[PDB]
Design an enzyme around this catalytic site. Structure first.
Site, PDB file in Angstrom:
ATOM      1  N   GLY A 155      18.794 -14.426  -9.321  1.00 48.06           N
ATOM      2  CA  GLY A 155      20.061 -15.127  -9.443  1.00 48.06           C
ATOM      3  C   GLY A 155      21.127 -14.476  -8.586  1.00 48.06           C
ATOM      4  O   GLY A 155      21.530 -15.008  -7.552  1.00 48.06           O
ATOM      5  N   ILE A 189       0.559  11.231   7.061  1.00 42.42           N
ATOM      6  CA  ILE A 189       0.983  11.716   8.371  1.00 42.42           C
ATOM      7  C   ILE A 189       0.761  10.580   9.381  1.00 42.42           C
ATOM      8  O   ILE A 189       0.020   9.631   9.095  1.00 42.42           O
ATOM      9  CB  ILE A 189       0.181  12.965   8.778  1.00 42.42           C
ATOM     10  CG1 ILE A 189      -1.292  12.602   8.996  1.00 42.42           C
ATOM     11  CG2 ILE A 189       0.331  14.049   7.725  1.00 42.42           C
ATOM     12  CD1 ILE A 189      -2.104  13.692   9.668  1.00 42.42           C
ATOM     13  N   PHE A 248       0.837  -1.196   0.000  1.00 45.21           N
ATOM     14  CA  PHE A 248       0.000   0.000   0.000  1.00 45.21           C
ATOM     15  C   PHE A 248       0.873   1.248   0.000  1.00 45.21           C
ATOM     16  O   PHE A 248       0.362   2.364  -0.117  1.00 45.21           O
ATOM     17  CB  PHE A 248      -0.973   0.002   1.193  1.00 45.21           C
ATOM     18  CG  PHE A 248      -2.124  -0.976   1.048  1.00 45.21           C
ATOM     19  CD1 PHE A 248      -3.025  -1.171   2.088  1.00 45.21           C
ATOM     20  CD2 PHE A 248      -2.300  -1.696  -0.129  1.00 45.21           C
ATOM     21  CE1 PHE A 248      -4.077  -2.065   1.959  1.00 45.21           C
ATOM     22  CE2 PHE A 248      -3.351  -2.594  -0.258  1.00 45.21           C
ATOM     23  CZ  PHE A 248      -4.243  -2.771   0.789  1.00 45.21           C
ATOM     24  N   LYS A 249       2.190   1.039   0.108  1.00 46.63           N
ATOM     25  CA  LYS A 249       3.170   2.123   0.092  1.00 46.63           C
ATOM     26  C   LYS A 249       2.727   3.299   0.948  1.00 46.63           C
ATOM     27  O   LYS A 249       2.607   4.429   0.468  1.00 46.63           O
ATOM     28  CB  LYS A 249       3.482   2.548  -1.345  1.00 46.63           C
ATOM     29  CG  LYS A 249       4.320   1.469  -2.079  1.00 46.63           C
ATOM     30  CD  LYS A 249       4.801   1.907  -3.438  1.00 46.63           C
ATOM     31  CE  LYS A 249       5.599   0.799  -4.099  1.00 46.63           C
ATOM     32  NZ  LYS A 249       4.785  -0.451  -4.250  1.00 46.63           N
TER      33      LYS A 249
HETATM   34  O1  LIG Z   1      -2.890  15.336   3.738  1.00 43.09           O
HETATM   35  C1  LIG Z   1      -2.493  16.027   4.811  1.00 43.09           C
HETATM   36  C2  LIG Z   1      -1.232  16.669   4.772  1.00 43.09           C
HETATM   37  C3  LIG Z   1      -0.835  17.397   5.901  1.00 43.09           C
HETATM   38  O2  LIG Z   1       0.366  18.043   5.926  1.00 43.09           O
HETATM   39  C4  LIG Z   1      -1.672  17.470   7.026  1.00 43.09           C
HETATM   40  C5  LIG Z   1      -2.909  16.810   6.991  1.00 43.09           C
HETATM   41  N1  LIG Z   1      -3.285  16.099   5.900  1.00 43.09           N
HETATM   42  C6  LIG Z   1      -4.601  15.443   5.914  1.00 43.09           C
HETATM   43  O3  LIG Z   1      -5.577  16.460   6.079  1.00 43.09           O
HETATM   44  C7  LIG Z   1      -6.622  16.005   6.981  1.00 43.09           C
HETATM   45  C8  LIG Z   1      -6.653  16.908   8.193  1.00 43.09           C
HETATM   46  O4  LIG Z   1      -7.682  16.528   9.101  1.00 43.09           O
HETATM   47  P1  LIG Z   1      -7.785  17.173  10.557  1.00 43.09           P
HETATM   48  O5  LIG Z   1      -6.365  17.241  11.130  1.00 43.09           O
HETATM   49  O6  LIG Z   1      -8.821  16.321  11.302  1.00 43.09           O
HETATM   50  O7  LIG Z   1      -8.311  18.570  10.429  1.00 43.09           O
HETATM   51  C9  LIG Z   1      -6.323  14.536   7.264  1.00 43.09           C
HETATM   52  O8  LIG Z   1      -6.963  13.733   6.274  1.00 43.09           O
HETATM   53  C10 LIG Z   1      -4.810  14.458   7.067  1.00 43.09           C
HETATM   54  O9  LIG Z   1      -4.329  13.160   6.742  1.00 43.09           O
HETATM   55  O1  LIG Z   2       6.727  -1.893  -5.358  1.00 42.38           O
HETATM   56  C1  LIG Z   2       7.562  -1.964  -6.403  1.00 42.38           C
HETATM   57  C2  LIG Z   2       8.775  -1.236  -6.337  1.00 42.38           C
HETATM   58  C3  LIG Z   2       9.648  -1.314  -7.428  1.00 42.38           C
HETATM   59  O2  LIG Z   2      10.836  -0.640  -7.411  1.00 42.38           O
HETATM   60  C4  LIG Z   2       9.311  -2.097  -8.548  1.00 42.38           C
HETATM   61  C5  LIG Z   2       8.091  -2.790  -8.543  1.00 42.38           C
HETATM   62  N1  LIG Z   2       7.242  -2.700  -7.488  1.00 42.38           N
HETATM   63  C6  LIG Z   2       5.980  -3.462  -7.523  1.00 42.38           C
HETATM   64  O3  LIG Z   2       6.317  -4.831  -7.674  1.00 42.38           O
HETATM   65  C7  LIG Z   2       5.377  -5.475  -8.579  1.00 42.38           C
HETATM   66  C8  LIG Z   2       6.133  -5.971  -9.786  1.00 42.38           C
HETATM   67  O4  LIG Z   2       5.268  -6.609 -10.720  1.00 42.38           O
HETATM   68  P1  LIG Z   2       5.788  -7.033 -12.166  1.00 42.38           P
HETATM   69  O5  LIG Z   2       6.599  -5.853 -12.714  1.00 42.38           O
HETATM   70  O6  LIG Z   2       4.535  -7.465 -12.937  1.00 42.38           O
HETATM   71  O7  LIG Z   2       6.702  -8.218 -12.025  1.00 42.38           O
HETATM   72  C9  LIG Z   2       4.295  -4.438  -8.866  1.00 42.38           C
HETATM   73  O8  LIG Z   2       3.281  -4.532  -7.869  1.00 42.38           O
HETATM   74  C10 LIG Z   2       5.046  -3.121  -8.688  1.00 42.38           C
HETATM   75  O9  LIG Z   2       4.215  -2.010  -8.393  1.00 42.38           O
END
Ligand SMILES: O=c1cc(O)ccn1[C@@H]1O[C@H](COP(=O)(O)O)[C@@H](O)[C@H]1O
Ligand SMILES: O=c1cc(O)ccn1[C@@H]1O[C@H](COP(=O)(O)O)[C@@H](O)[C@H]1O
Ligand SMILES: [Ca+2]
Ligand SMILES: [Ca+2]
Lengths: 213, 213
Positions: free
Chosen positions: A180, A75, A70-71
């Site tokens: 490999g 925050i 999900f990378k």
């Molecule tokens: O995307 C960013 C980047 C930021 O630097 C700060 C908050 N956010 C997002 O903004 C939203 C702020 O919600 P709050 O702190 O409840 O007001 C929340 O979804 C949070 O993840």
């Molecule tokens: O997370 C990384 C980071 C990388 O540097 C390269 C691929 N990946 C992920 O690995 C998977 C590789 O799938 P493929 O290229 O079909 O063999 C794919 O989910 C891609 O998003």
């Protein structure tokens, strides 16, 4: 590399990246290779298309380990919620970005320790755009992981000398997977399309594994 | 700041960050503030808990604009799939990270162009960990956005002089949202908990909006 007792065992050192976006096709391929692979990496393309319930389905049907790719890159408070929801859905592990810094990573580690799951720190990526910012930060992100007690990492296979460098930073015992010579440094490789797009996925998986021998 | 014709109009310059993780509570709050807010930011905590179908529900019930705060941060091919699935689900716009580099961002812009939707580039974040890597990259990421034809940005409100700097890079016409004087630089502010955790959300939304005078 021999298996370390304190980190996960991936059957045949081969992780399937299941990036098909249709439930039927995803389940078919995964079921076909279950005798070769016990660890499946699932990302947003499949879960956003089919729902987070697909994780539990993979587990009930195949009993495979699930890594949620999900990378995670928000925050800290938000990272916590994403991890909680993902582990609640049944994922054994989650992949998180290091670029947002130590507190964002620690938030994930906290939830993972509470729930008995694992966090993988993504140190570096393979695509050309990774040269702009990620490449220059990779060593520091890896060292940050070490200073966060991180035991599971993701690194690119494209440049093996980068894995050697990574392995030097993280030490010889930490778990490393790579999308490999790769298996001299990484503990498992991640393969997607070469398996899930083949006419015989079980044959593709078998072929890769024969090479690993 | 006056509204630019070529970028989105956010009602009352107030975006609701709906980070509740239960569908019932999320829908209740959003319906209550619809007379004050027409733009809702939804992130992974809600969609992973309740399903991507929640987006179409917000739209069919309230007719609000939806920004998917998914902080997209994968390789280009994967980013493409994430954006496609997200827009298919009905999101009007998606927030993407810039640190994975130009190709990863362009992949999102391509899909958005195809599907008639919008991409927001996240330039910088406000949590303490952002100092490690994100802060040092922020100006370059913004300039990258300008060189990618990006027209919508996200920046932090906590350090206003940082918004002034951002605004200097992106120019006076681009659309900028930020989580008072924030509105001298940003076009809208993003507010979550102060609204959705209040006993009367409609009153909290009204109070903030009165301050915008
Ligand atoms: O995307 C960013 C980047 C930021 O630097 C700060 C908050 N956010 C997002 O903004 C939203 C702020 O919600 P709050 O702190 O409840 O007001 C929340 O979804 C949070 O993840
Ligand atoms: O997370 C990384 C980071 C990388 O540097 C390269 C691929 N990946 C992920 O690995 C998977 C590789 O799938 P493929 O290229 O079909 O063999 C794919 O989910 C891609 O998003
Ligand atoms: Ca082991
Ligand atoms: Ca406008």
């Amino acid at each position: 590399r021999s298996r370390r007792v304190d980190v996960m065992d991936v059957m045949n050192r081969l992780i399937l990246a299941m990036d098909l976006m249709n439930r039927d096709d995803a389940l078919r391929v995964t079921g076909e290779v279950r005798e070769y692979i016990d660890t499946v990496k699932i990302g947003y393309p499949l879960v956003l298309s089919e729902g987070m319930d697909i994780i539990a389905e993979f587990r009930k049907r195949f009993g495979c380990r699930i890594i949620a790719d999900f990378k995670v890159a928000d925050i800290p408070e938000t990272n916590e919620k994403i991890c909680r929801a993902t582990f609640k859905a049944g994922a054994d592990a989650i992949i998180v970005h290091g670029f947002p810094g130590a507190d964002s990573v620690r938030a994930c580690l906290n939830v993972a320790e509470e729930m008995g799951r694992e966090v993988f720190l993504l140190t570096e990526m393979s695509h050309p755009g990774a040269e702009m910012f990620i490449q220059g930060a990779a060593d520091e992100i890896a060292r940050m992981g070490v200073d966060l007690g991180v035991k599971n990492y993701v690194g690119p296979s494209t440049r093996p000398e980068r894995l050697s460098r990574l392995r030097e930073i993280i030490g010889q015992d930490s778990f490393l997977i790579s999308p490999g010579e790769t298996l001299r440094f990484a503990d498992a490789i991640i393969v997607g399309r070469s398996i899930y797009l083949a006419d015989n996925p079980a044959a593709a998986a078998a072929g890769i594994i024969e090479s690993i021998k």
